[PDB]
Amino acid sequence: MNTPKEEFQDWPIVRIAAHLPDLIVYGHFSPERPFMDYFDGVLMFVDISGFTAMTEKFSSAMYMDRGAEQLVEILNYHISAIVEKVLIFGGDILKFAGDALLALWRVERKQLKNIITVVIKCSLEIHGLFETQLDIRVKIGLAAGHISMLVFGDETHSHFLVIGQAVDDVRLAQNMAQMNDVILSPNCWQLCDRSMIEIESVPDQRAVKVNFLKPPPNFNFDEFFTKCTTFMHYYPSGEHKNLLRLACTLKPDPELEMSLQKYVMESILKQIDNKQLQGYLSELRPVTIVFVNLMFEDQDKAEEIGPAIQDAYMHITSVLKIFQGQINKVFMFDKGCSFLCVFGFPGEKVPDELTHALECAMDIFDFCSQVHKIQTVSIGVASGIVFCGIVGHTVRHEYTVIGQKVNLAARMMMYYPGIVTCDSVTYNGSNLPAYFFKELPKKVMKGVADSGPLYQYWGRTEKV
Amino acid sequence: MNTPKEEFQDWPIVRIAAHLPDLIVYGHFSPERPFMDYFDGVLMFVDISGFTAMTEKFSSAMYMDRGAEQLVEILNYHISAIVEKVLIFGGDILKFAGDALLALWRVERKQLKNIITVVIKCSLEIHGLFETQLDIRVKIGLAAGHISMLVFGDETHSHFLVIGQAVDDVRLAQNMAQMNDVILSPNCWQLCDRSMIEIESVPDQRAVKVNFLKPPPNFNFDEFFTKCTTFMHYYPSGEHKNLLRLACTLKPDPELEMSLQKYVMESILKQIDNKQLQGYLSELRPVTIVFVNLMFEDQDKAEEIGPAIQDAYMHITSVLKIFQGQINKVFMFDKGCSFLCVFGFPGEKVPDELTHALECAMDIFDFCSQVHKIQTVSIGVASGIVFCGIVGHTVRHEYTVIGQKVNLAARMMMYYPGIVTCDSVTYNGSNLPAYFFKELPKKVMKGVADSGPLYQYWGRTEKV
Amino acid sequence: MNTPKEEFQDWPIVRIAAHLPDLIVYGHFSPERPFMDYFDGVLMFVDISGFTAMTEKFSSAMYMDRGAEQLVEILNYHISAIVEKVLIFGGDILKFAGDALLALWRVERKQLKNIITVVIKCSLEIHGLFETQLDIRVKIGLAAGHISMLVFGDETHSHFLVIGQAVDDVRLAQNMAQMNDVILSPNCWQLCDRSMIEIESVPDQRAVKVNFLKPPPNFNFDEFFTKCTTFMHYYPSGEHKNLLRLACTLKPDPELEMSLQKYVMESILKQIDNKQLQGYLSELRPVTIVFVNLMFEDQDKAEEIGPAIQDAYMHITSVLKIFQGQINKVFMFDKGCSFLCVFGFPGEKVPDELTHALECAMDIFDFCSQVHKIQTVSIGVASGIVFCGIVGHTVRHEYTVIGQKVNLAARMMMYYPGIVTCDSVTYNGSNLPAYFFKELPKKVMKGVADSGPLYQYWGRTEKV
Ligand SMILES: Nc1ncnc2c1ncn2[C@@H]1O[C@H](COP(=O)(O)CP(=O)(O)OP(=O)(O)O)[C@@H](O)[C@H]1O
Ligand SMILES: Nc1ncnc2c1ncn2[C@@H]1O[C@H](COP(=O)(O)CP(=O)(O)OP(=O)(O)O)[C@@H](O)[C@H]1O
Ligand SMILES: Nc1ncnc2c1ncn2[C@@H]1O[C@H](COP(=O)(O)CP(=O)(O)OP(=O)(O)O)[C@@H](O)[C@H]1O
Ligand SMILES: [Ca+2]
Ligand SMILES: [Ca+2]
Ligand SMILES: [Ca+2]
Ligand SMILES: [Cl-]
Ligand SMILES: [Cl-]
Ligand SMILES: [Cl-]
Ligand SMILES: [Cl-]
Numbered sequence A, B, C: 001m002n003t004p005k006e007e008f009q010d011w012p013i014v015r016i017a018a019h020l021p022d023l024i025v026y027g028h029f030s031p032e033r034p035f036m037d038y039f040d041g042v043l044m045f046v047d048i049s050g051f052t053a054m055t056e057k058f059s060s061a062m063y064m065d066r067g068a069e070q071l072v073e074i075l076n077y078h079i080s081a082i083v084e085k086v087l088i089f090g091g092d093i094l095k096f097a098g099d100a101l102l103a104l105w106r107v108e109r110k111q112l113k114n115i116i117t118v119v120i121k122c123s124l125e126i127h128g129l130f131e132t133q134l135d136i137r138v139k140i141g142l143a144a145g146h147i148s149m150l151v152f153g154d155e156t157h158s159h160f161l162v163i164g165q166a167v168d169d170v171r172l173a174q175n176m177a178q179m180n181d182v183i184l185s186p187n188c189w190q191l192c193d194r195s196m197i198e199i200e201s202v203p204d205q206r207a208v209k210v211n212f213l214k215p216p217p218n219f220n221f222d223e224f225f226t227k228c229t230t231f232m233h234y235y236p237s238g239e240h241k242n243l244l245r246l247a248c249t250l251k252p253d254p255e256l257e258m259s260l261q262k263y264v265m266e267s268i269l270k271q272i273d274n275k276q277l278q279g280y281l282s283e284l285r286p287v288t289i290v291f292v293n294l295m296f297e298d299q300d301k302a303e304e305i306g307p308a309i310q311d312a313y314m315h316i317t318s319v320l321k322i323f324q325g326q327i328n329k330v331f332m333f334d335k336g337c338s339f340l341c342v343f344g345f346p347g348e349k350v351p352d353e354l355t356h357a358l359e360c361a362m363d364i365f366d367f368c369s370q371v372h373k374i375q376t377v378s379i380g381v382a383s384g385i386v387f388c389g390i391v392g393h394t395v396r397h398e399y400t401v402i403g404q405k406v407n408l409a410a411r412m413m414m415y416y417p418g419i420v421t422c423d424s425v426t427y428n429g430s431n432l433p434a435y436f437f438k439e440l441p442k443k444v445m446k447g448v449a450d451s452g453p454l455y456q457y458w459g460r461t462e463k464v
């Protein structure tokens, strides 16, 4: 009898699981919302510099209207390589955010110290890719300690995010990095194996910069790594050691698929289901970004903030429905929970996009300001040409947005807290009377090329 | 000089041949119609229970409008595995019929006894897949003996089917099976190697149930199987022993392709030809099933019935053209030749589908009742949401329909012989006056969940 | 740590490079236009006979409207095999022209003699494929010596072509070939290793026919070939010896991709970019062919003719824009530079195609007749059903046109020099008054089945 080769079957459930971390794929938690889980781990936050400027340049005539295609190609060529190293080193990519990503090594507390060495070795290999071969740099922040996960949503949509000091720290660490630095959180530094890791300290900072690894005499990284894999639940092994992810072996299971699909946008499921040409989700399109930020008294306290995020989510999704927008991503962004919402994504191109974005934003502002435990709401609104597309590796990728206007909306919400703000394109393009707005003082902002005048959306009735 | 790897070329002719058995692919018979051929073989009829109920459940809201996609995925995951075992054990899948399939081992008469052992071993391995790991069972019927093939059609369309006592028997055998039984026809039992095959007998039945194989002391199944492959014309071997089918090696040949394509529906050829997205042939769509049954004096006598089927076919295809329907499948269904016809398939969505289905059915009834050697015509008409899609394995698959309404239309034609019947959806939804119909006595029917009231389509003029 | 398999990544840049020779892919020359480069090499011009007759036959009813699909399948099955042998023997396919192709072995002058032996061995292996197994023959012409390349175009489009005596010779040689001959140019014969190559001479010709290779006693072709690969810049080797082309390894590089894409038509880039179903570029469509020929005093003198071709190109592309046509291919066609232009390609289906083709042709005629160094302009216009599609191998293929009308337009331009001519379909179908034309004397033409009456497009005003 023959034993013929079994071709890989790229079932729908496998295509879905490319868009999710192992944390969700193999999580099996309750469908109650909010749901909270607690664990320890090491986080790596990898941030590429230079793609929003490249994004702007790929709209230029030299690209002959293949800018989106060229952009995604050159982005994924680079990001794929970084995704592979994370996976090969045993990490779980949690989420892509534009030209950045967040990765997790979830381990028992006794194993943190050793796992930190693994993650540093990985981060230095990723740093390496950028010291070779046009205009892009990488900042890496590392953190370790207690992590909480929140799952929130409704009967058709699910979102997760991670919370706690390690989460805050990893972003803090990454923000300090000079171009091409690997920075460890103070807690990471405290738990790491200091006899191996040569650091230099950082100005007015307890966080530290990694110079190099200095293995002891008998040290063998492959044997060490192998010991560490004992603690790695899903590391591909044995018959599957040739795969980047165990998720590549998932088999059809309608219950699991129903649960996983709730995390993925409808337009992406259409493509997975071969109901739309692939070409069409990579685009440079004019959209409006609505970047919502919710601040709490204590943003590390999941059982306090979880209900409030769920509450906020329920209202947000309902008004976005009305005003025709979508939630692209939710994540903790030092100080708060941020929702990155988009008007004008595939299918939801309306006229009066701008007006709607503003009225939606005001509605969210009003409602969220009264949700218990939400200290402060801030919302930034910006409009322009943004890259929208699937970023990552074939085995692990997500739909995301990259552009100067995304950055602008995020920086507005931080530099102008407690109000709804908008850019000049949104202001000028809105249907709305000029006295619905206030012209704002100009602020020098980080990592935003130029704002042009900014405004507060004061809203329809007077407040003085 | 290099000897570079030769990538598999999935030519159109290879994609076409996935939809056909070796019986047709390598058959090369006359293009005259009808054409009849005679041989011996073993038949296996594998019938999955539980997918029409799953079909009904996958229309529910929990599936979030990805019911068709989820259904086909979970169906093919299972059916693919069964198709592989048949192929690996040397069989030819002849035809898929919903959630069932029919397979053939064509051999010289002296080899039947040994081949029956092979097919039993296969059937017990398939039975096995169902004793592991939600709500599906498998009934397997086996038959052996003389088989005739009929090829019928016109200058652009071809159909085949198998005929004779073994064909009748394999369906009889399968219908007796308690859930998960393997049943042998009486003739199969008579020809098999009884010293190996432990059976228990069956109530008021000469057919028998297989308990297990009980190989003699020296018996080695792999050596036995290898001996049997001497008699297997197309068993992949040598350089091609890593392939499931020799048909995977077919090379472009416009004459052969012209001949093979006549068996495949136009919408499928469009997809093969990359002129339509794959996603679109898997659907849960509202259709009307017209299940036509033709009974003859002797349904095992190919040279008698062949002309009549050809005649019936010519008229059927012509009125289906007019009323916008299609022949999905033709097969012998104890007592007669059945045509499973569909109104509302991809492209042929009209309004007045229902009326048309009824007028078409009456026309076919009238014409076929006068074709010489057609003893009785019965036609069942039912309307509802049915799964329409490609079922099977990548190397061997066919477009088919699965649903409670398909079953209903088949059961109507059998329980209400000699008339055209319809369900309540068809009745209520038709354009037609109430006195064109007669309300029928309710019959308890097998493997149909509930009919609702049924009617006879009496037709336009009175008969009393 | 795992070392998982790296799946082949079919990046856009790799898909683009399938449409271009190594000459361009790895060329990196100036973006100035015209650009001229000079080298030596051996040329092989492989011409299949019988596909324009097959093209005509595949429009017939027997093909059941899958003629385009069947045609391209059977063409590529054959042409792929020829492309593979060229690549494996170290050649660079420069260009496809319908059912023919031109291949180049670019080498230092001292290596011509040995390389000629390699190319003959290849040509005899290709001749071989046609002596096996319906109605197609192959004529092969070989030439060797000095070659110039011209790159011409504008800021969004690039074209190249090869020029010089070897180029003229290879087409001359191929035109003499009796069906299935391999003919060497006189210069090729003069440089080859005559102690190995047994020829018979040719009627009123210095060119020669290859009978066979007659290796000396110690000769080992594999060792010889290996020596020759020292001189082959891009021969796949080492880790990549399993690939047909080094171009299969190209990595994303936006500068390179911007440069390469300028050679490829927009409709093809759309398909590369997964913005259109593949099925749609293979078609049998009614088009109008405008075959422009420019003759110069000396057509081997690149620095003379290069400016004139660039000048002609600039005007041609501008009027084709206006009249909605496209340049399909440009090449030297003994005596001159020919532009094969098409009206009615994917997307550019207009009514008044015919009129436009004629007015465009007259405009080009008028303008090019005054470009300095253009001795004579001739333009042939023919309309009918032509095959339009991607021809070649997966790793090396191009969009091209095949049909009796393409041949007709080429033969008109040669047999009726110095005027614009058209066929009867174009004449009768044009919007234009009869006295805009002159009915021409009928000429017996080579390799054109029947012309029907031909006309000169005299144009709008009288000349007498
Ligand atoms: N798709 C996305 N998801 C979440 N946050 C985003 C985002 N795009 C931009 N941001 C936010 O925009 C802000 C500007 O970010 P920085 O990270 O300082 C830009 P950078 O990394 O140096 O170069 P870049 O603009 O080429 O990315 C950050 O607060 C970042 O979190
Ligand atoms: N696509 C299809 N082709 C041919 N016959 C079909 C069909 N779908 C249903 N039928 C017929 O419908 C009838 C009801 O069949 P059964 O085989 O008793 C149902 P079952 O196998 O127990 O479970 P199921 O309804 O989940 O399939 C049978 O006569 C069967 O042949
Ligand atoms: N796509 C294309 N590109 C360039 N030239 C073309 C062409 N199609 C046809 N021609 C030209 O048409 C003319 C007729 O060519 P021949 O090469 O004698 C036909 P053949 O090769 O014997 O058989 P065929 O018509 O089946 O191809 C030649 O001058 C050829 O260069
Ligand atoms: Ca960034
Ligand atoms: Ca069934
Ligand atoms: Ca030719
Ligand atoms: Cl997160
Ligand atoms: Cl999210
Ligand atoms: Cl059958
Ligand atoms: Cl059939």
Ligand SMILES: [Cl-]
Pocket: C094, C095, C160, C161, C162, C330, C331, C332
């Ligand atoms: Cl050329």
Ligand SMILES: [Cl-]
Pocket: C159, C160, C328, C329, C330, C331
């Ligand atoms: Cl060209």
